[PDB]
Amino acid sequence: PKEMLRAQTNVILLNVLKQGDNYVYGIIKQVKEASNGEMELNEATLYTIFKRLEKDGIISSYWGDRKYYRLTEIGHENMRLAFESWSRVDKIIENLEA
Amino acid sequence: PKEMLRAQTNVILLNVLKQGDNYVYGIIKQVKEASNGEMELNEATLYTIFKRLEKDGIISSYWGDRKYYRLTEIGHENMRLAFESWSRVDKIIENLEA
Ligand SMILES: Cc1cc2nc3c(=O)[nH]c(=O)nc-3n(C[C@H](O)[C@H](O)[C@H](O)CO)c2cc1C
């Protein structure tokens, strides 16, 4: 299911960035560690996703003193809205089971 | 965010069907109750989503002795796979926070 994995990777990448500004290799390390090894992102997958997020204003980038990525203001608020509504969804689903 | 609401509604509808075969009005009642009133689905929204799920083999339909909908075999397994991987995602996200 290609576009569910895509969605999953998006959420994860945004959450890494939420923890702090980071660069591609740093992100890939953090995701591999937090996933107990089960998830090893390809450098190129990150460039594809980051090209799209930048265009949509959700993230921005800049150079160290190596390319760093940053969650924008829009990006933070979009994450908050997403977490809020998906949490409603999770409780609705909880009420359907019992 | 049109296509996130769409995704949310999909998950909810599939979970209703997971609880048991149901018909459009019954589903809408159950979702409104489980959502403490915050979520009132339109009859037409359900037809749009159910047309797509049927085509993809995820659900099927039949008449009572009124149209009933049913999660297919594929449908159940797809739900299980989705719940499993999103649960990995949730734990990965948990490790990134602390
Ligand atoms: C920020 C966030 C975004 C999510 N996005 C999706 C999604 O696009 N599709 C999906 O099926 N589940 C998503 N989920 C998980 C969802 O709440 C649910 O656990 C699974 O969809 C299966 O129940 C998301 C969860 C979080 C916390």
Author numbering:
A (entry chain A), B (entry chain A): 5 to 69, 76 to 108
From the manuscript:
LmrR belongs to the PadR-like family of transcriptional regulators (Pfam PF03551), which is named after a regulatory protein involved in the regulation of expression of phenolic acid decarboxylase (pad) genes. LmrR was shown to be a transcriptional repressor of lmrCD expression and an autoregulator of its own expression. LmrR forms a dimer with each monomer comprising a typical winged helix-turn-helix DNA binding domain and a C-terminal helix involved in dimerization. In between the two monomers is a large central pore that serves as the drug-binding site.
Riboflavin was identified as a ligand of LmrR by co-crystallization screening. The crystal structure of the riboflavin-bound LmrR complex (LmrR•RBF) was solved by molecular replacement and refined at 2.35 Å. Extra density in the central drug-binding pore confirmed the presence of bound ligand, but docking of riboflavin was complicated by the occurrence of alternative binding modes. Different potential binding modes of RBF fitting the electron density were tested by short 200 ps molecular dynamics runs, resulting in the identification of two stable unique binding modes with similar predicted binding energy. These two binding modes of RBF are related by a ~180° flip of the heterocyclic isoalloxazine moiety relative to the ribityl side chain. The occupancy of each of the four binding modes in the crystal was estimated to be 0.25. The flat aromatic isoalloxazine ring of riboflavin slides into the center of the flat-shaped hydrophobic pore of the LmrR dimer, in between the indole rings of the central Trp96/Trp96’ pair, while the ribityl substituent protrudes towards the pore opening. Riboflavin recognition by LmrR is likely dominated by the aromatic stacking interactions of the Trp96/Trp96’ indole pair with the heterocylic aromatic core of riboflavin. Near the pore opening, Asp100 may contribute to the stabilization of the hydrophilic ribityl moiety of riboflavin, by the formation of hydrogen bonds, although the observed disorder of the ribityl moiety indicates that these interactions are quite weak. The dissociation constant (Kd) for binding of RBF to LmrR was determined as 0.26 ± 0.08 μM, using a fluorescence-based titration assay.
